Amino acid sequence: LPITGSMDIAYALTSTLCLYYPTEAATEINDNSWKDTLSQLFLTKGWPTGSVYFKEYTNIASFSVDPQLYCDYNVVLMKYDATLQLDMSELADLILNEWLCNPMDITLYYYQQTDEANKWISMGSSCTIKVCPLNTQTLGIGCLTTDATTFEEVATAEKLVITDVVDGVNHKLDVTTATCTIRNCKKLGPRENVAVIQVGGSDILDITADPTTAPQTERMMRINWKKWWQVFYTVVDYVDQIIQVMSKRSRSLNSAAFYYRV
Amino acid sequence: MASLIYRQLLTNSYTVDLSDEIQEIGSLLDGPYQPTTFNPPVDYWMLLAPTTPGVIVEGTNNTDRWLATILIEPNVQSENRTYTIFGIQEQLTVSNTSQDQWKFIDVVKTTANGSIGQYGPLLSSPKLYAVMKHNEKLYTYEGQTPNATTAHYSTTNYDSVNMTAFCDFYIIPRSEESKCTEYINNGLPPIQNTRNVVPLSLTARDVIHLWKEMQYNRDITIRFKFANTIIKSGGLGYKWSEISFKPANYQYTYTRDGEEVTAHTTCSVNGMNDFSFNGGYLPTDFVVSKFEVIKENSYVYIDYWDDSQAFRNVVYVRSLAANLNSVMCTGGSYNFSLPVGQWPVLTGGAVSLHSAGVTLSTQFTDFVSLNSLRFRFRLAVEEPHFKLTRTRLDRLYGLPAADPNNGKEYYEIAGRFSLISLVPSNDDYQTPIANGELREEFNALSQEIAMSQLIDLALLPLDMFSMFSGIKSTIDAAKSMATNVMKKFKKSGLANSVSTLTDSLSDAASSIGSSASAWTDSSVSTQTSTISRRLRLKEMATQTEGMNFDDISAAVLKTKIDKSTQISPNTIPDIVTEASEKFIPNRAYRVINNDDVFEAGIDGKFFAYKVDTFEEIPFDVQKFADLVTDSPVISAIIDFKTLKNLNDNYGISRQQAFNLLRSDPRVLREFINQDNPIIRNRIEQLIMQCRL
Amino acid sequence: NSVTVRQDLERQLGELREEFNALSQEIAMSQLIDLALLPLDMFSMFSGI
């Protein structure tokens, strides 16, 4: 709907905050009441008491299992390593973006792509995704329609895979439909309710499959560390900027999932 | 305008011939069956097709002669052979010059225990025998192929002849005689042409089989097999004749989330290749006549049947589609049996199957007729090699008809099929799960149609697409819907009229008008009526201005087709043919000449008037006949009676009257809007006449 | 008697739309009007096809 205002007239909380931390921080701090200390620090900062929830994840891969967050304002601390950058980028792109998915099945249907705003998402314990294209008359090229060995590998021993292939061609997929489920999702736009704080070194986190584009938005932040309490203090004492850099939900067709909005 | 639907109807009608040609190709053999005992009735033929050496067929009399048939393979010179004739062994001399065509010989005993001879020389490559019994004489095939005759004998007890065969035979009536020779002299007919594809138990009665749409989207797991037929030729096992593919049957069970579904499947192959491995001409050497292999130009069909809430609504199909997943089939080793030396072994051979079509099919197991789904499969050649060792046959691709089973007793195909069925729902409940008066109804329904919308529709021309795009159709019958209506229309009364007019016009290139022409050929009333009846055909000459009668006829036909529901797809051609002719017998036409107008009616009305003040004008037949030959003609929807009543009782202007004489749709519809009683009366009188 | 060669594919419909949109400049006006004047049919459509 149109908005009508003016440019010459002088024109000028009750939200939720979730902090996501690795369990290694909990192991290192060696305390049980530090949640109370953080709550009281937030209360001093100007947040209401009993209005902050903390969620813990065992591992990066484990947290990649249905990562749907349940806060209006979200900031997640992500571990740093140089041997798992792909999965970190996958998680960042799945969290920072909004997606609308559809159910799929591999043993009965064929699938294809037609727009670059649609990709394949498989989530679960482990997804051994294998795929090869077809021709118009449904004959395998570099593969046989029944042989599961000649199928090219695109994902092995992965807990969360975001795959994209050449559009406009039907494809056949093979995976064990008892350990991982696949869905067809489209990128509707930006998800402004979340932010990622990469606690570590240089950033390789790419939020797009297009090579020519390297979007470095203001919703991605990087910081070095040697003690977890330093990171926690920096996060708590600087809520204003990390909150004003984000906004509320812009979704036109909301999903069905749990939410924590006190 | 809307009359164009008529003009196209007779235009593309020629295409039916092409379809008719296809129809004659589709215009049917009963069989094959198990070798049993029966009494094939008179007026029926016996199309036998054995492949294995032995006693082929014998007709028992027990009082009249004995008839015996012996089949002899080629590559056997003058020697003596033993058979089992009527259960008693007998030796027969055989001498063969042909090398690739088998030969049949008839053996006749003058009584039950008479003398034995060999006659009836028959040579054929498909190895087909024809025997008939009709009109106090027995017919049997005699004469060299392809064209031959029938030997005739006359022996008592014709209708009681019961012939016990030992092969696969077809029973055909007399009318398909032209088929029979074409199916005897021209190789082995394809298996899909048969009625009872599977050679299982014989039946002499097999029959090939407001609403609501119902959608069934289920899943199938087809397990299917192949079948080989192997025969050994003459000699001492040193050479074989035929190793071919034959139809197979498989009944199994599986799970579909709880149900032990029983799936019955039958397989067939068509268009196979026959590689020839011709050995040496010496009598003792490994020679193979035909090696049947499957290649890219060959297909395999599977007929699938199983009880389910989906399969119990298949008799009427609205839409059908297949989304199968391809399955690979690989062959196994097939070792020959050569008594001396090392026997050859076949190895390799692998193909893949993909789905490229689906339709209905017939299948029987014991006495239960089924309405099965036939899935068509195209084939592709693959990587694995296929060779015949111990010989010079190498570097060939495909799959041999020797051992495609490869040990496995079933080939699995998993896929999903979606079909839409039509179910009689007299209301919006009580939907079934398992499976004349129309003239009066059509004539009675024709009193309530509106007029302005009728004129609007008559303004918009129709075509071959809009006529049937508003009526629901069954995909099986929608294939031949335009074809049938055009075939029936090319035999309509209008067709005869136009053909006669064309013939008379052409003959004229060798009365009541000024000279001789193809249109000038109470006496005044009768002559004018004949002229009007002939001029009615001008509506197919595209020489009209504005709207015409046939446009109104087409519009009312479309409206009453849409509203009606008691008409079957088999009934549309008759209604269209009758309506295109009988509609509106009271037609009127008027022509204009120098501010004068002459009008004539089929019923016998004739008038003349001026365009200024509508003064009555004496009638001149000569000038009417002179001008109507080549001049604009306009359908007289508004004839002189309505026009004069309007000019008297209503104050119209000159433009309105002049357009009315031209029957302009805009002013006529404006009058309709004004709801003038005279125009309403005229339109309603015209509409009421539209009935069969 | 060789294994069937893998059938070729088709240019992407998106690329087709891009190419057809880019081809706009290379069209004359009066000649196109006169061509539109000439009726066409199924035989006249695929003469170069």
PDB file of C-alpha atoms in Angstrom, chain B residues 395-558:
ATOM      1  CA  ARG B 395      30.548 -56.837 -32.202  1.00  0.00           C
ATOM      2  CA  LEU B 396      26.759 -56.797 -32.047  1.00  0.00           C
ATOM      3  CA  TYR B 397      24.509 -54.972 -29.588  1.00  0.00           C
ATOM      4  CA  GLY B 398      21.052 -55.733 -28.232  1.00  0.00           C
ATOM      5  CA  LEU B 399      19.582 -58.611 -26.227  1.00  0.00           C
ATOM      6  CA  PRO B 400      19.199 -62.162 -27.580  1.00  0.00           C
ATOM      7  CA  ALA B 401      16.012 -64.198 -27.326  1.00  0.00           C
ATOM      8  CA  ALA B 402      17.847 -67.136 -25.744  1.00  0.00           C
ATOM      9  CA  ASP B 403      18.106 -66.551 -21.970  1.00  0.00           C
ATOM     10  CA  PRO B 404      16.905 -63.078 -20.945  1.00  0.00           C
ATOM     11  CA  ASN B 405      15.733 -64.466 -17.595  1.00  0.00           C
ATOM     12  CA  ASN B 406      19.342 -64.383 -16.314  1.00  0.00           C
ATOM     13  CA  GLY B 407      18.367 -66.514 -13.308  1.00  0.00           C
ATOM     14  CA  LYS B 408      16.106 -63.868 -11.787  1.00  0.00           C
ATOM     15  CA  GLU B 409      12.460 -64.936 -11.825  1.00  0.00           C
ATOM     16  CA  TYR B 410      11.153 -61.355 -12.053  1.00  0.00           C
ATOM     17  CA  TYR B 411      12.145 -57.923 -13.347  1.00  0.00           C
ATOM     18  CA  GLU B 412      11.067 -55.080 -11.069  1.00  0.00           C
ATOM     19  CA  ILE B 413       9.585 -51.812 -12.346  1.00  0.00           C
ATOM     20  CA  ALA B 414       8.407 -49.219  -9.804  1.00  0.00           C
ATOM     21  CA  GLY B 415       6.439 -46.124 -10.768  1.00  0.00           C
ATOM     22  CA  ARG B 416       3.326 -44.022 -10.270  1.00  0.00           C
ATOM     23  CA  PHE B 417       0.370 -43.772 -12.651  1.00  0.00           C
ATOM     24  CA  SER B 418      -2.399 -41.170 -12.460  1.00  0.00           C
ATOM     25  CA  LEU B 419      -5.777 -41.522 -14.169  1.00  0.00           C
ATOM     26  CA  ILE B 420      -9.070 -39.626 -13.955  1.00  0.00           C
ATOM     27  CA  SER B 421     -12.315 -41.602 -14.191  1.00  0.00           C
ATOM     28  CA  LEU B 422     -15.901 -40.544 -14.866  1.00  0.00           C
ATOM     29  CA  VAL B 423     -18.511 -41.909 -12.458  1.00  0.00           C
ATOM     30  CA  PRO B 424     -22.319 -41.544 -12.695  1.00  0.00           C
ATOM     31  CA  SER B 425     -23.308 -39.282  -9.789  1.00  0.00           C
ATOM     32  CA  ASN B 426     -27.002 -38.448 -10.097  1.00  0.00           C
ATOM     33  CA  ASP B 427     -26.507 -36.183  -7.057  1.00  0.00           C
ATOM     34  CA  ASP B 428     -23.643 -34.967  -4.865  1.00  0.00           C
ATOM     35  CA  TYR B 429     -23.733 -38.181  -2.818  1.00  0.00           C
ATOM     36  CA  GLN B 430     -23.926 -41.945  -3.403  1.00  0.00           C
ATOM     37  CA  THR B 431     -20.922 -42.042  -5.709  1.00  0.00           C
ATOM     38  CA  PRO B 432     -20.443 -45.553  -7.152  1.00  0.00           C
ATOM     39  CA  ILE B 433     -17.093 -47.255  -6.655  1.00  0.00           C
ATOM     40  CA  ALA B 434     -17.415 -50.284  -8.962  1.00  0.00           C
ATOM     41  CA  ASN B 435     -18.791 -50.537 -12.495  1.00  0.00           C
ATOM     42  CA  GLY B 436     -35.440 -42.124 -28.640  1.00  0.00           C
ATOM     43  CA  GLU B 437     -36.770 -39.615 -26.117  1.00  0.00           C
ATOM     44  CA  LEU B 438     -33.914 -37.226 -26.945  1.00  0.00           C
ATOM     45  CA  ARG B 439     -35.841 -35.928 -29.964  1.00  0.00           C
ATOM     46  CA  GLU B 440     -38.799 -34.912 -27.798  1.00  0.00           C
ATOM     47  CA  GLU B 441     -36.543 -33.436 -25.119  1.00  0.00           C
ATOM     48  CA  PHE B 442     -34.540 -31.416 -27.659  1.00  0.00           C
ATOM     49  CA  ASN B 443     -37.706 -30.112 -29.307  1.00  0.00           C
ATOM     50  CA  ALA B 444     -39.245 -29.151 -25.954  1.00  0.00           C
ATOM     51  CA  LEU B 445     -36.084 -27.437 -24.665  1.00  0.00           C
ATOM     52  CA  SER B 446     -36.173 -24.988 -27.604  1.00  0.00           C
ATOM     53  CA  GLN B 447     -38.690 -22.492 -26.169  1.00  0.00           C
ATOM     54  CA  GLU B 448     -36.685 -20.668 -23.481  1.00  0.00           C
ATOM     55  CA  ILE B 449     -33.523 -19.378 -25.198  1.00  0.00           C
ATOM     56  CA  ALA B 450     -32.858 -15.648 -25.084  1.00  0.00           C
ATOM     57  CA  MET B 451     -32.618 -13.502 -28.210  1.00  0.00           C
ATOM     58  CA  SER B 452     -29.961 -10.828 -27.658  1.00  0.00           C
ATOM     59  CA  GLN B 453     -27.376 -13.415 -26.607  1.00  0.00           C
ATOM     60  CA  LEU B 454     -28.435 -15.549 -29.578  1.00  0.00           C
ATOM     61  CA  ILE B 455     -27.703 -12.664 -31.953  1.00  0.00           C
ATOM     62  CA  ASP B 456     -24.419 -11.968 -30.161  1.00  0.00           C
ATOM     63  CA  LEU B 457     -23.303 -15.575 -30.604  1.00  0.00           C
ATOM     64  CA  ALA B 458     -24.413 -15.539 -34.244  1.00  0.00           C
ATOM     65  CA  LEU B 459     -22.134 -12.517 -34.676  1.00  0.00           C
ATOM     66  CA  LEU B 460     -19.058 -14.449 -33.495  1.00  0.00           C
ATOM     67  CA  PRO B 461     -18.098 -17.216 -35.957  1.00  0.00           C
ATOM     68  CA  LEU B 462     -17.259 -20.675 -34.665  1.00  0.00           C
ATOM     69  CA  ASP B 463     -14.703 -23.241 -35.846  1.00  0.00           C
ATOM     70  CA  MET B 464     -13.684 -26.880 -35.413  1.00  0.00           C
ATOM     71  CA  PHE B 465     -12.337 -26.101 -31.918  1.00  0.00           C
ATOM     72  CA  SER B 466     -15.113 -24.078 -30.269  1.00  0.00           C
ATOM     73  CA  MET B 467     -17.837 -26.581 -31.186  1.00  0.00           C
ATOM     74  CA  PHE B 468     -16.563 -29.321 -28.850  1.00  0.00           C
ATOM     75  CA  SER B 469     -14.519 -27.261 -26.363  1.00  0.00           C
ATOM     76  CA  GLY B 470     -17.509 -26.759 -24.054  1.00  0.00           C
ATOM     77  CA  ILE B 471     -18.595 -30.400 -23.856  1.00  0.00           C
ATOM     78  CA  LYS B 472     -16.893 -33.003 -21.685  1.00  0.00           C
ATOM     79  CA  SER B 473     -15.257 -35.881 -23.536  1.00  0.00           C
ATOM     80  CA  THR B 474     -13.662 -39.257 -22.858  1.00  0.00           C
ATOM     81  CA  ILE B 475     -10.047 -39.465 -24.004  1.00  0.00           C
ATOM     82  CA  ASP B 476     -10.692 -42.822 -25.680  1.00  0.00           C
ATOM     83  CA  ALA B 477     -13.565 -41.410 -27.762  1.00  0.00           C
ATOM     84  CA  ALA B 478     -12.267 -37.845 -28.176  1.00  0.00           C
ATOM     85  CA  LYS B 479      -9.689 -39.277 -30.596  1.00  0.00           C
ATOM     86  CA  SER B 480     -12.445 -39.849 -33.172  1.00  0.00           C
ATOM     87  CA  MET B 481     -15.044 -37.142 -32.594  1.00  0.00           C
ATOM     88  CA  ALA B 482     -14.417 -34.657 -35.398  1.00  0.00           C
ATOM     89  CA  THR B 483     -13.656 -37.573 -37.725  1.00  0.00           C
ATOM     90  CA  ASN B 484     -17.027 -39.264 -37.177  1.00  0.00           C
ATOM     91  CA  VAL B 485     -19.094 -36.078 -37.447  1.00  0.00           C
ATOM     92  CA  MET B 486     -17.303 -35.123 -40.668  1.00  0.00           C
ATOM     93  CA  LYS B 487     -17.766 -38.633 -42.087  1.00  0.00           C
ATOM     94  CA  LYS B 488     -21.489 -38.452 -41.353  1.00  0.00           C
ATOM     95  CA  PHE B 489     -21.657 -34.881 -42.677  1.00  0.00           C
ATOM     96  CA  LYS B 490     -20.117 -35.761 -46.043  1.00  0.00           C
ATOM     97  CA  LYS B 491     -23.210 -37.957 -46.571  1.00  0.00           C
ATOM     98  CA  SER B 492     -25.705 -35.241 -45.602  1.00  0.00           C
ATOM     99  CA  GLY B 493     -28.497 -33.781 -47.702  1.00  0.00           C
ATOM    100  CA  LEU B 494     -26.574 -30.532 -48.082  1.00  0.00           C
ATOM    101  CA  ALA B 495     -23.676 -32.578 -49.456  1.00  0.00           C
ATOM    102  CA  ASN B 496     -25.931 -34.069 -52.132  1.00  0.00           C
ATOM    103  CA  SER B 497     -27.325 -30.622 -52.948  1.00  0.00           C
ATOM    104  CA  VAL B 498     -23.879 -29.054 -53.337  1.00  0.00           C
ATOM    105  CA  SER B 499     -22.608 -32.009 -55.380  1.00  0.00           C
ATOM    106  CA  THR B 500     -25.615 -31.771 -57.705  1.00  0.00           C
ATOM    107  CA  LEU B 501     -25.138 -28.015 -58.078  1.00  0.00           C
ATOM    108  CA  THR B 502     -21.460 -28.474 -58.946  1.00  0.00           C
ATOM    109  CA  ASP B 503     -22.272 -31.236 -61.439  1.00  0.00           C
ATOM    110  CA  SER B 504     -24.985 -29.133 -63.090  1.00  0.00           C
ATOM    111  CA  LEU B 505     -22.665 -26.116 -63.261  1.00  0.00           C
ATOM    112  CA  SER B 506     -19.906 -28.169 -64.886  1.00  0.00           C
ATOM    113  CA  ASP B 507     -22.391 -29.790 -67.277  1.00  0.00           C
ATOM    114  CA  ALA B 508     -23.640 -26.313 -68.219  1.00  0.00           C
ATOM    115  CA  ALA B 509     -20.262 -25.631 -69.879  1.00  0.00           C
ATOM    116  CA  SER B 510     -21.272 -27.829 -72.840  1.00  0.00           C
ATOM    117  CA  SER B 511     -35.790 -21.047 -69.143  1.00  0.00           C
ATOM    118  CA  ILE B 512     -37.112 -18.432 -66.708  1.00  0.00           C
ATOM    119  CA  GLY B 513     -34.108 -16.083 -66.843  1.00  0.00           C
ATOM    120  CA  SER B 514     -32.580 -14.167 -69.722  1.00  0.00           C
ATOM    121  CA  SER B 515     -30.534 -17.135 -70.987  1.00  0.00           C
ATOM    122  CA  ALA B 516     -29.232 -20.551 -69.938  1.00  0.00           C
ATOM    123  CA  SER B 517     -27.575 -20.703 -66.518  1.00  0.00           C
ATOM    124  CA  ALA B 518     -27.265 -23.192 -63.675  1.00  0.00           C
ATOM    125  CA  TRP B 519     -29.785 -21.243 -61.570  1.00  0.00           C
ATOM    126  CA  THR B 520     -32.649 -20.472 -63.999  1.00  0.00           C
ATOM    127  CA  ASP B 521     -33.434 -24.137 -64.728  1.00  0.00           C
ATOM    128  CA  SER B 522     -49.864 -20.484 -58.751  1.00  0.00           C
ATOM    129  CA  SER B 523     -47.383 -21.370 -61.493  1.00  0.00           C
ATOM    130  CA  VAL B 524     -45.396 -18.237 -60.641  1.00  0.00           C
ATOM    131  CA  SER B 525     -45.511 -19.351 -57.005  1.00  0.00           C
ATOM    132  CA  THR B 526     -44.157 -22.819 -57.823  1.00  0.00           C
ATOM    133  CA  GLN B 527     -41.374 -21.499 -60.055  1.00  0.00           C
ATOM    134  CA  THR B 528     -40.350 -18.923 -57.445  1.00  0.00           C
ATOM    135  CA  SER B 529     -40.389 -21.595 -54.734  1.00  0.00           C
ATOM    136  CA  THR B 530     -38.082 -23.793 -56.808  1.00  0.00           C
ATOM    137  CA  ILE B 531     -35.796 -20.808 -57.412  1.00  0.00           C
ATOM    138  CA  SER B 532     -35.673 -20.113 -53.669  1.00  0.00           C
ATOM    139  CA  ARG B 533     -34.980 -23.766 -52.836  1.00  0.00           C
ATOM    140  CA  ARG B 534     -32.052 -23.780 -55.257  1.00  0.00           C
ATOM    141  CA  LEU B 535     -30.863 -20.383 -53.982  1.00  0.00           C
ATOM    142  CA  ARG B 536     -30.727 -21.811 -50.453  1.00  0.00           C
ATOM    143  CA  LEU B 537     -27.401 -23.358 -51.498  1.00  0.00           C
ATOM    144  CA  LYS B 538     -25.977 -19.852 -52.015  1.00  0.00           C
ATOM    145  CA  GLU B 539     -25.226 -19.787 -48.277  1.00  0.00           C
ATOM    146  CA  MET B 540     -22.219 -22.025 -48.985  1.00  0.00           C
ATOM    147  CA  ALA B 541     -20.999 -19.637 -51.707  1.00  0.00           C
ATOM    148  CA  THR B 542     -19.727 -16.911 -49.317  1.00  0.00           C
ATOM    149  CA  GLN B 543     -21.635 -14.346 -51.413  1.00  0.00           C
ATOM    150  CA  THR B 544     -23.831 -13.021 -48.596  1.00  0.00           C
ATOM    151  CA  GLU B 545     -23.966  -9.743 -46.690  1.00  0.00           C
ATOM    152  CA  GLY B 546     -24.529  -9.621 -42.957  1.00  0.00           C
ATOM    153  CA  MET B 547     -26.097 -12.439 -40.979  1.00  0.00           C
ATOM    154  CA  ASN B 548     -27.688 -15.535 -42.501  1.00  0.00           C
ATOM    155  CA  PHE B 549     -30.050 -18.333 -41.490  1.00  0.00           C
ATOM    156  CA  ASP B 550     -27.336 -20.959 -41.044  1.00  0.00           C
ATOM    157  CA  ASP B 551     -25.643 -18.727 -38.465  1.00  0.00           C
ATOM    158  CA  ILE B 552     -28.812 -18.766 -36.352  1.00  0.00           C
ATOM    159  CA  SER B 553     -29.093 -22.530 -36.826  1.00  0.00           C
ATOM    160  CA  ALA B 554     -25.504 -23.052 -35.666  1.00  0.00           C
ATOM    161  CA  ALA B 555     -25.997 -20.748 -32.677  1.00  0.00           C
ATOM    162  CA  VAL B 556     -29.155 -22.495 -31.488  1.00  0.00           C
ATOM    163  CA  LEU B 557     -27.485 -25.872 -32.040  1.00  0.00           C
ATOM    164  CA  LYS B 558     -24.541 -24.820 -29.866  1.00  0.00           C
TER     165      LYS B 558
END
